[PDB]
């Protein structure tokens, strides 16, 4: 008797659901008066303060593998390039056929890395075919046919190519991501979370910390670090797994350079437009290369292998170089300055272990390409213009995207892989999730109104 309903508004409970999240970035590039492909497209202001707030006595489920807000991220990263490239002039007229030779570099009779390439092109808007010349990297060039030979670009037959507008910069910037009105974001302050299952310490925030859309395979660089020990995350259904993410607690320096000096040459296709071509080479010629501290890396491989063994307790672990296939997997990929570096990582992942510090620097040969299958997309490619002079680079390696082969007798063969671009960000957005508020609630109580 005398138990009687009451209703509350503003209630603190929640349920899981998908949402449309906000972009959130700096105002103008690195707060510098230049155009940036990410920041400049609105994305609201340089929100300085994350509203972190910690929860007493909250245990929370989390599924970073199935979390909805990686999909919207991938959709957003795709769309920004797609809309930004559109006004830039295309490469379609140049796709016509080529007749070219070995290039004579300065003070040199040969250069084994360079074709010098001659091509027909429309010089006025829509007439006056004429001959013109430039030079290209091999791996945008192919050839078979004719009574005498005949040359062609790698991708223009299968897919359309567009060169990025030259003033736009590729460099990544920290982007924050905020929930819209009526939803919130949870974190797992826990420093050893596996990625799935309940989370024993949870805090909430309107916006995530800055996340950097670094394009990379084979290595997580310019990223975050685990606060506790190294964390190894994998699919939980079976021993064999789709991908494994290792995330270091200490980050190792990588520097890279492209020493050859490059001067530019420009070809007018169009009206208020210009195809940007690569011209004469200058300077003592070397291939691009990167440098890593040796002894620190030896400790790094000992540490990650020390924890792989906890799962996998028998004697052997074997790391191996890339498996094979097309180049896009078998070299470590990134971009720096204004061009996209591809490096043969095989010398760096040749170790083997059994169970039971600014010297001796290792160097890796690293190759460079100008036409790209970006976002691993069907039927489309991008072209990158050359940058004047040499380039120097520094970045901080943070982790690996590795894969396991089909098992064999008392011997495991781990090599780089995973490959899917979504795993790049799934390695960093594992902490977060998005959730809806239901502010309404009902209860019994010892209370009424007056009928008068």
């Amino acid at each position, epitope marked *: 008797e005398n138990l009687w309903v009451t209703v509350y508004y503003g209630v603190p409970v929640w349920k899981e659901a998908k949402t449309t999240l906000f972009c959130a970035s700096d105002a103008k590039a690195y707060e510098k008066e230049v155009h940036n492909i990410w920041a400049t497209h609105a994305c609201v202001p340089t929100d300085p303060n994350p509203q972190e707030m910690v929860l007493k006595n909250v245990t929370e489920n989390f599924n970073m593998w199935k979390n909805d807000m990686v999909d919207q991220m991938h959709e957003d990263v795709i769309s920004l390039w797609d809309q930004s490239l559109k006004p830039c002039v295309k490469l379609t007229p140049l796709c016509c056929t080529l007749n070219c030779t070995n290039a004579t570099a300065s003070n040199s009779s040969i250069i084994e890395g360079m074709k010098n390439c001659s091509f027909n092109i429309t010089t006025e808007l829509r007439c006056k075919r004429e001959k013109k010349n430039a030079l290209f990297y091999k791996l945008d060039i192919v050839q078979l046919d004719g009574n005498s030979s005949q040359y062609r670009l790698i991708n223009c037959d299968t897919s359309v190519i567009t060169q990025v507008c030259p003033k736009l910069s590729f460099d990544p910037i920290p982007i924050h991501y905020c929930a819209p009105a009526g939803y919130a974001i949870l974190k797992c302050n826990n420093k050893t979370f596996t990625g799935t299952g309940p989370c024993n310490n949870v805090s909430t925030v309107q916006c995530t910390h800055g996340i950097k859309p670094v394009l990379s395979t084979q290595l997580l660089l310019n990223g975050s670090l685990a606060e506790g020990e190294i964390i190894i995350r994998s699919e939980n259904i079976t021993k064999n797994v789709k991908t494994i993410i290792v995330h270091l607690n200490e980050s190792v320096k990588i520097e890279c350079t492209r020493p050859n000096n490059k001067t530019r040459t420009s070809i007018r296709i169009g009206p208020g437009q210009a195809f940007y071509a690569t011209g004469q080479v200058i300077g003592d010629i070397r291939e691009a290369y990167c440098n890593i501290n040796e002894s620190k890396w030896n400790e790094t491989l000992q540490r990650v292998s020390k924890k792989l063994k906890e799962y996998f307790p028998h004697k052997n672990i074997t790391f191996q170089p890339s498996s094979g296939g097309d*180049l896009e997997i078998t070299t470590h990929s990134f971009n720096c300055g204004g061009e996209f570096f591809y490096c043969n990582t095989s010398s760096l992942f040749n170790r083997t272990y059994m169970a039971n510090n600014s010297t001796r620097t290792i160097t890796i040969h690293c190759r460079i390409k100008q036409i790209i299958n970006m976002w691993q997309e069907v039927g489309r490619a991008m072209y990158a213009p050359p940058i004047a002079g040499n380039i120097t680079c520094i970045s901080n390696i943070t982790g690996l995207l590795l894969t396991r082969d089909y098992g064999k007798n008392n011997t495991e063969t781990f090599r780089p892989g995973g490959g899917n671009m979504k795993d790049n960000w799934r390695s960093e957005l594992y902490k977060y999730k998005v959730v809806k508020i239901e502010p309404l609630g009902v209860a019994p109580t010892r209370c009424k109104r007056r009928v008068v």
Partner: nanobody
Amino acid sequence: QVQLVQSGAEVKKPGASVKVSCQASGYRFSNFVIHWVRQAPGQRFEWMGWINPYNGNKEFSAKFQDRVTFTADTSANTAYMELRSLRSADTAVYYCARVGPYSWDDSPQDNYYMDVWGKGTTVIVSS
């Protein structure tokens, strides 16, 4: 070791379709392009096309583009092919293939030579 294993032999009706599968082992299936090749009795091998499981881009011989279709699945370690509108000339032994690994010195598409094959499958067009 490396092996590619195929479906059973087929005898199918004229005018209908024939569909074949090719399951692999010994290597990560998602990191190698896959070919399809046919040989009639006593004749040359004829190119059909290629597929790259990593992306699903496709390229066909224009002789067969209206007749053939490929697809691949990373969770199955298997590639599929489908040839529509069978005729008596299609009676042949069909193969799937794998290419060699790219190396640093290679130009593009130096490696699409046939590195490994399967045991093949017999297809006969008959009522």
